[PDB]
Design a protein around this nucleic acid. Structure first.
Length: 118
RNA sequence: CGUUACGCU
């Protein structure tokens, strides 16, 4: 089985619970080194119709899902709008994302969609 | 190992 990254964080690295308002940019000093090095299972929303898959985490995104952008079909979209327009409005759009991409290629995953296999 | 393409994001 598995535990939600949201809980998993709430428990070992943060002490507090995430709410629609928490800003991880502040808990960053220790959060990132805490996260770097672990494996997570990305479970795409049911509306993506895609099988879960695993990634090594490299850290936190520099910005939250709502600010952080990438290129999709030749357009800027934030992580938040991307998930929204794929029929899954994020619960925490203000949360920073898990960075699983490499130096040349960004891949940012909303923490609510990530879990750790135990 | 490299380059495209396509996903992912």
């Amino acid at each position: 089985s598995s535990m939600p990254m949201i809980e998993y964080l709430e428990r070992f690295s943060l002490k507090a619970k995430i709410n629609n308002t928490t800003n991880l940019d502040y808990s960053r000093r220790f959060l990132e080194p805490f996260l770097r090095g672990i494996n997570v299972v990305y479970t795409p929303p049911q509306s993506f119709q895609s099988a879960p898959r695993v990634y090594r985490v490299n850290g936190l995104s520099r910005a939250p899902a709502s600010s952080e952008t990438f290129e999709h079909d030749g357009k800027k979209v934030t992580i938040a709008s991307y998930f929204h327009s794929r029929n899954y409005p994020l619960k925490f759009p203000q949360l920073h994302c898990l960075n699983v991409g490499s130096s040349i290629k960004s891949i940012l995953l909303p923490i609510e969609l990530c879990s750790i296999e135990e």
